[model samples]
Target: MAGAQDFVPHTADLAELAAAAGECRGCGLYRDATQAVFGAGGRSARIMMIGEQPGDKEDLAGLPFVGPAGRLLDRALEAADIDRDALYVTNAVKHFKFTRAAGGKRRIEKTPSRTEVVACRPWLIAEMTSVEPDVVVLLGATAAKALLGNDFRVTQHRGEVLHVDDVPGDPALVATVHPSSLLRGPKEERESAFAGLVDDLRVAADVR
Candidate 1:
């Protein structure tokens, strides 16, 4: 029953903030989603991992990046000598948007609208302020667009380090392909794209 004015997160207490977020009604996404799905991992992480939104598994599990795409990200992180447990993981939009088929058994994924993204921005801002990571790895166009604006081009901007002045402490932000993109792309393209994503992550790792 919290109002928009009650949405402020606890700056120094992530757990309390996360609890507050779980009950957040800043947007209509809460009505459809099972839960808010807050960021996870070390409280003092140096690098933060961002995804477009929660997938089906993530929506059901109430955790970010625990699905196929998440597994792919884990593999890439392992290959790049990055520790999953050491990095903070979150989503650009915390809610899951999907439409169930006539049978109401299969859920089809839908992209969050711009309004939803804007509505969800407060939580992401709070997360960055609390964690204060030195580097941020944006997993796809949604995440990139959220942080870098609508004009951001993954093809042209991927692997490039962008200094986001908006974030408190101004972390170095890097955009890359989402692991789900690699899963859907053609085999040859997938390999190349995955490599490109890994390269960007390596750069992020170096920045820390």
Candidate 2:
């Protein structure tokens, strides 16, 4: 039963951190997941983007946000004039938590529990320590709570720049809906969701 504690210390680089995340069994997620999807991006990114966790496709692909959501995120960032190549993208948790259909036809993702998120906090902290990003954009409520506590609401506080004292480097923060939600939204509502995310991203862009 490996935990996040095992890998948080002595990280040489993002590559090492990403490699070590695969062995984490900090919670029960590793047992069923295909692979741990680690954060990937430039080393000196001033902005860091954090998502909730890997989706089914991400788990199989061993990457973050490479699914439909990632694609939409790319578009939204572009619309906001944010350079993703200049930012580090990661997740609150490394492993993909999910359940398969009764007939094994499809796998639907399950939210990582609060305890699981807490257990995985060390990894996120470690990445933050290494990246030292000036601006951090949290992708959804789950990602918001992971760093801002359970009381922080992405809906109420989104689009506003916040400074996190506990994060040491105290980066400016912003939060928004996950791209997956926009994809799931009705065709008419999707445009609004996409625009909102792009708008939120502009705040981060301003600081960067």
- Per-residue alpha-carbon lDDT of candidate 1 for residues 1-208, written as tens digits (9 for 90 to 100): 2333358655757788778888888777777888878888867899998998888899898899999899889988987899999999999888788888996688888998877777787787888888889999988888888888888888897668897657767899988888987777679987887788789999999984
- In the range 151-200, model 2's lDDT, one tens digit per residue, is 88887887799876578489998988888887876787999888889889
Off by over 4 Å in 1: 1-6
For each candidate in turn, the TM-score is 0.93, 0.94
lDDT values, one for every candidate:
0.83, 0.85
Model 1, CA-based lDDT: 0.83
Residue pairs clashing, model 1: none
Best by lDDT: 2
Backbone clashes under 3 angstroms, per model: 0, 0
List candidate 2 segments past 4 Å from native: 1-3
